[PDB]
Amino acid sequence: PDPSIDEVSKSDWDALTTQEQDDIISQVENLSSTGWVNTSRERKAEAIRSAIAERDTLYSGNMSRLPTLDGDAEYFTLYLSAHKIQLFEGGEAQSESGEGGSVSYSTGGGGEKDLQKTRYGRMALEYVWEDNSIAALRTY
Amino acid sequence: PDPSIDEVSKSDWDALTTQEQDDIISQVENLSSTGWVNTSRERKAEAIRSAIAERDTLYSGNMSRLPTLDGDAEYFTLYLSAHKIQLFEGGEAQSESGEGGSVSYSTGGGGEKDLQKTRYGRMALEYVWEDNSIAALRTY
Amino acid sequence: PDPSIDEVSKSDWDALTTQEQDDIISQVENLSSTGWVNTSRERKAEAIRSAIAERDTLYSGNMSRLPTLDGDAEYFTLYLSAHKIQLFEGGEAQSESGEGGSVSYSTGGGGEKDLQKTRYGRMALEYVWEDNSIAALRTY
Amino acid sequence: PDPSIDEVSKSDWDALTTQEQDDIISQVENLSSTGWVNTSRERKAEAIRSAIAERDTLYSGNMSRLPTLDGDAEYFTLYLSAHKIQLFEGGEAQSESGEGGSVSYSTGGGGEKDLQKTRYGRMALEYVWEDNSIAALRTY
Amino acid sequence: PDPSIDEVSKSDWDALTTQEQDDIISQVENLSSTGWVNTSRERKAEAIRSAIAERDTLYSGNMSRLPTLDGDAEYFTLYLSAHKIQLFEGGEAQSESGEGGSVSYSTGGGGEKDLQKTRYGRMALEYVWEDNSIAALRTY
Amino acid sequence: PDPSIDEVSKSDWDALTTQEQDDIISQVENLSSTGWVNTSRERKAEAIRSAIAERDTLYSGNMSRLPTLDGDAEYFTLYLSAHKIQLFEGGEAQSESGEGGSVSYSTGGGGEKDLQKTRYGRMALEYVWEDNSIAALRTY
Amino acid sequence: PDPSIDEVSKSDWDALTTQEQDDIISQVENLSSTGWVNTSRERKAEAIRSAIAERDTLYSGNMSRLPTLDGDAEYFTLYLSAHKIQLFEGGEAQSESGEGGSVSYSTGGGGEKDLQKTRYGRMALEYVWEDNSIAALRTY
Amino acid sequence: NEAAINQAIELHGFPQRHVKVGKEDGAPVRDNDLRRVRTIFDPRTTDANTAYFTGQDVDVETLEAHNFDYSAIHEMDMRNLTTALGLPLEAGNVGADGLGSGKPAELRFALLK
Ligand SMILES: [Mg+2]
């Protein structure tokens, strides 16, 4: 996208023209084979806007002078967006069944925390030190 | 929304016009693909009003002079609202079945506490230090 | 491929011709017997681009002067690409059933982490010291 | 095969004629009763090429001056190839069922690691000290 | 067999006539009531050749001056061959079912290692100190 | 039998007449109600020959000057033969079902080792100190 | 029986008339309500002969000057015979089912050892100190 | 033996700081990440009353000074050398119990004279 999702703050996202937002929305939709096509454009925009805001507030600043977002900020924000869309869709499906067959996926339930709870959130955690507390300071 | 949910206290929410409330309700409805369309407007207003009141009373003040709401206050209040709407709708659904097929979602049961018990509450916890006790004081 | 995936950074990937990208996409598709044929070329491109970016940002640098990517960088990036495509497909299938029979696969959920969650990510981990902390430094 | 798989590096594999690659591919196919016949020749070539590259990069060098590949290098590379072809096919099948009957195989899920996860990888591990850390050095 | 399987190294196996190989293959087939008759002669040759090579490389040398292959070398190589043929046939079957009835075998899952994973490998382990570490040396 | 199975070494078994072997085979068949009638004469000969060889190599010599085969050597070799025939016939059945009814046997899975894994091997273990390490030596 | 089973060694059993053996076989058959009628007379003779041999070799001698067969030697040898006939019949049945109904027996799997594994062997153990190690010696 | 003691005192006579970074079974820490931590904890710029503030995933371990009896090695070495050179032990600035008194003293000083 022309403005990239890592170049955009919450205030910037609101200032983007519809096409520039839809270009980023299109990029997030590439993170699922289904593209979440049955979830409305406004829900995808809310997921992205809240991923951007959450990056800038919860995954910002430093630990021992190191950036707390160590990974690529574009793909971190995209995985964080995909994580949110998957939660708006009701969660990560463990089993599916119907007229046309059945499947079960090896999720293993995961841990208790927010990002542990879907595949996109598990990807996002690797970009942010897996939510570990590496920070250190000293008296001068 | 023109007045944003983070700019509005319980007393302010009651003073809003119907349109200003419905604009915020419309924003909360973006956090589920279903929009909880079968749950009445007045349930949604109660969930938002009680999310606002719970923010201002339980997730307010400081720990070691850090703000106890470290995350974005808008999205925290929206996730806390979505958590409440989902608990008015029953629980978080773990399995669904009918004429049109079946699905199971990987909720994993989770922990015992209020916010742990829904996907929206699990998101909301990340904004408030995951309910941890970081507070400290000196004598002088 | 004429330019190999280990010779290509994120900025280089964007600069490649459609044919040079499709040549690498074709290589990644060789890591599944299904080739993920029912996923769009853009899903595969996004998986590769984000595998390249994640290599260069998360699996780069040194530990005790050892390179942190100890294994072959080509097959590491390819397995990391295959891992992402399989997560875009909803995850690793544990059981499958239909009109034509049924199968279940030895999987067992793995561990909690991202790369543990798919056979391709389990392969990728062996190239990067299985995500272990071997780094050491002195004072002088 | 005329050039044997243990005599061939990644660069050599690329230099081989189609026939003498197919001679090695034919040898790997002897490690399954099914021969993985429904997988394309290119899947098998990719599995072998990446087994060769993985041998030369992850299972090379010494521990306490002992070679890290203690077993026969031909059969190690063939089992490592078979392990990869089996992972390109999904997992190791634990249960199979259909019109013609049903079977379950004893696997026990294995451990969490890559090579533990299929029968060919369990065989391969015995050639490489079961991935144990026997290395030692002195100062002088 | 005229040349016995314990009298034959990998280089010798390759030098044998078809009849001398088929005589040894015939002996290995006596280790199953089914003889693995639906598995090709070339699978069986590969299993035997790789059993011979594996004996000579992994189950050779001394521990505490004791020979590491303590048992009869003929039957060790035959069980090691039968173990491999059984892994080429899938796993060890734990349950079987169809038009003509059903059976479950008391395999119990067993341990994680290669030889523990089928009945023939469990037999083979007794010939090699159950893979124990009895070796000892002095400094003179 | 005229020559008894405890009087016969591996070399002697090969020297016996067909009738002397069939007389011993007939004795081993008395250890099952089914006599393993659907398993060929040559499977049974292989089981007996390998029981004789395994007795002479694995269950021979002394511990603390006591013989390692403390029990009756005839019935030890016969049980060891029956153990092998049962493994050649796929393992010990835990459940059986069909047109004529169903049964489950109280096997309990047992321990991981070879002889623990069928009823005949459990009998055989009592003859050989249950595979315990009673051996002791002095210096002089 | 005129010669009782406790008065008879392996050599004596072979010297008995057919009628004297059949009289002891008839006694052993009284230990099951079914009498194991669908097993050949030769299976029963083998079970008794091997019970006699096993008594005289494994359950003979003294511990701390106490006899190691503390119970009645007749009924010990009969239960040991019945234990063997029951193991020639498969295992001890845990569940049975068919045209005429179904039953399950409260066996509970039991312990790992030979005699623990059927009801007759559990009875036999009480005669032999439950296989405990009471033996003691002095120096002089 | 003297050279061996000097080198052993240098390595083992003094405790040394070992900062361990990251969570056990957690995210790995690379050399460039440790360079920043080294800058915070540098013994060159630290002082006696420095205090440290950290997250839970930073551990300030220590290599204790590992006790060994270099004094007894010195006494043994000096005893060997003085006796080899035919001097009394006392010449090496080392002494022994009882030997400073009575007929035990009288003998060794008679031998020297
Ligand atoms: Mg990680």
GROMACS .gro file of N, CA and C and ligand atoms in nm, chain A residues 122 125-127 129-130, chain C residues 58-59 113-115 125 130-131, chain H residues 25-28 30, ligand 1:
model
   58
  122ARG      N    1  -0.057  -1.568   1.774
  122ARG     CA    2   0.064  -1.645   1.798
  122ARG      C    3   0.177  -1.597   1.707
  125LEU      N    4   0.297  -1.238   1.845
  125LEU     CA    5   0.378  -1.245   1.966
  125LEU      C    6   0.528  -1.253   1.938
  126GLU      N    7   0.571  -1.324   1.833
  126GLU     CA    8   0.712  -1.336   1.800
  126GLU      C    9   0.776  -1.201   1.765
  127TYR      N   10   0.696  -1.103   1.721
  127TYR     CA   11   0.744  -0.971   1.684
  127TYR      C   12   0.770  -0.882   1.806
  129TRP      N   13   0.884  -0.981   2.139
  129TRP     CA   14   0.956  -1.057   2.241
  129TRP      C   15   0.869  -1.161   2.312
  130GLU      N   16   0.761  -1.208   2.248
  130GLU     CA   17   0.666  -1.302   2.308
  130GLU      C   18   0.607  -1.249   2.440
  338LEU      N   19   1.348  -1.111   1.266
  338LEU     CA   20   1.341  -1.195   1.385
  338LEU      C   21   1.450  -1.301   1.390
  339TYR      N   22   1.494  -1.352   1.274
  339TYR     CA   23   1.590  -1.461   1.267
  339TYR      C   24   1.718  -1.414   1.198
  393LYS      N   25   0.392  -2.220   2.096
  393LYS     CA   26   0.449  -2.113   2.014
  393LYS      C   27   0.407  -2.125   1.868
  394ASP      N   28   0.418  -2.012   1.796
  394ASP     CA   29   0.391  -2.000   1.653
  394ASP      C   30   0.452  -2.113   1.569
  395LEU      N   31   0.585  -2.121   1.563
  395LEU     CA   32   0.648  -2.217   1.473
  395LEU      C   33   0.622  -2.363   1.514
  405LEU      N   34   1.220  -2.436   1.275
  405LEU     CA   35   1.286  -2.419   1.404
  405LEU      C   36   1.424  -2.483   1.411
  410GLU      N   37   1.638  -2.391   1.728
  410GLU     CA   38   1.513  -2.424   1.797
  410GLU      C   39   1.469  -2.311   1.891
  411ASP      N   40   1.498  -2.185   1.853
  411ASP     CA   41   1.465  -2.063   1.927
  411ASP      C   42   1.534  -2.053   2.064
 1005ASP      N   43   1.294  -2.074   2.855
 1005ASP     CA   44   1.198  -2.124   2.756
 1005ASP      C   45   1.121  -2.012   2.683
 1006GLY      N   46   1.165  -1.886   2.694
 1006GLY     CA   47   1.102  -1.770   2.630
 1006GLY      C   48   1.170  -1.727   2.499
 1007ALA      N   49   1.155  -1.599   2.464
 1007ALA     CA   50   1.212  -1.542   2.342
 1007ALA      C   51   1.365  -1.535   2.350
 1008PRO      N   52   1.441  -1.570   2.243
 1008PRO     CA   53   1.587  -1.561   2.248
 1008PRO      C   54   1.635  -1.416   2.240
 1010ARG      N   55   1.976  -1.187   2.129
 1010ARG     CA   56   2.092  -1.193   2.040
 1010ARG      C   57   2.203  -1.100   2.091
 1094MG      MG   58   0.991  -1.746   1.949
   0.00000   0.00000   0.00000
